[PDB]
Amino acid sequence: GEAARIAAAIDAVIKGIETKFGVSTNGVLGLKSLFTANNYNNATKIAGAIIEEYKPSSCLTGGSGADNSICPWAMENFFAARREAVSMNDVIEKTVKTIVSDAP
Amino acid sequence: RKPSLLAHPGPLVKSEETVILQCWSDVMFEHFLLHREGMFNDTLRLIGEHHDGVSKANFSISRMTQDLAGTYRCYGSVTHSPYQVSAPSDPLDIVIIGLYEKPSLSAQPGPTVLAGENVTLSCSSRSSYDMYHLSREGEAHERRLPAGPKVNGTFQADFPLGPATHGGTYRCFGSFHDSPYEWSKSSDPLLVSV
Ligand SMILES: *[C@@H]1O[C@H](CO)[C@@H](O)[C@H](O)[C@H]1NC(C)=O
Ligand SMILES: *[C@@H]1O[C@H](CO)[C@@H](O)[C@H](O)[C@H]1NC(C)=O
């Protein structure tokens, strides 16, 4: 029922984040804690957790040894993306907005 | 080659005040990457303005906020090798001032001395700051000394300036190890006259 609809949209967000950023949420405690009925649609919380766990700004020097999985995305979409200042954290938030909206 | 990171008018910014972080180099970098390391790390991709044989880019903070304070560093890139970024610039700490009690700056033996006289500026406060910063107007290198004695219920850091050679207006700040980008209200400027 609605419980099934909730899990369907949560999995869509999880799959969306993983395929768009080229990362895996397996073992990622901060992100998995937010995959709930209320916290799975808050783009601000998810964007903040991706930055906290995957440390995208650390990809400037190759990444934090703890998780350099987001670096291919960071390089393609920010550091070597092909005027005004562009914030890395803004780009991440804007990407999460599209994943959440195109999830259904 | 290592770019240069500057703050205009300076790295010591007041809350809600404006500051411009300038990234520049003699090497023609098409893009500049400004990294902030602090409570909320972020990287900004600035477009390089090639002019006068120097490439430069500005990052303007219209209203200074706590989340924007931190250690900034500039990296340079060229569309030729977009994956090979330059060595970072020397770190620039953007500090928010005016958050704690204004310390008191006094001169010993006095604020007006004959050349060759040993002067020692004394920074004091009721608050137990972990560090005191003595700034000479014009100079960028601030002097940090923890507190030595305790006088009249106030902790004090005494900065010996050695024999007098030239004058200057000095200011004083206090900081805490746990809040590194938040400093005290500036002390009232003390004019030393040799
Ligand atoms: C959604 O995120 C915002 C910003 O953090 C905040 O209102 C709160 O964390 C969340 N609101 C909810 C779940 O109602
Ligand atoms: C000033 O201090 C120096 C270094 O301690 C020492 O020679 C002496 O105390 C003073 N010398 C003067 C007044 O020239």
Residue numbers in the entry:
A (entry chain A): 165 to 246, 254 to 275
B (entry chain B): 27 to 220
Give excerpts from the publication.
For RBK21, the variable region (residues 148–299) was mixed with the KIR2DL1 ectodomain and crystallized. The variable regions of both RBK21 and KEN-01 consisted of a helical bundle that presented extended loops and short helices at the KIR-proximal end. In both cases, the KIR2DL1 binding site was formed from two helices and two loops, which contacted the D1 domain of KIR2DL1, with a conserved binding pose despite only 53% of the KIR2DL1-contacting residues being shared. The binding site was centred around a conserved hydrophobic core, with L224 and F242 from each RIFIN occupying a shallow hydrophobic pocket containing residues L59, Y101 and V111 of KIR2DL1. This was stabilized by an intermolecular β-sheet, which contained loop 4 of RBK21 or KEN-01 and ended with a hydrogen bond linking S258 of RBK21 or KEN-01 and D68 of KIR2DL1. In RBK21, residue S221 was at the centre of the interface. To develop a non-binding mutant of RBK21 for future studies, we produced S221R. This abolished binding to KIR2DL1, as shown by SPR analysis, despite circular dichroism indicating that it adopted the correct fold. Inspection of the RBK21–KIR2DL1 structure showed that the KIR2DL1 residues, which interact with RBK21, were almost completely conserved in KIR2DS1, except for the conservative substitution of V111L.
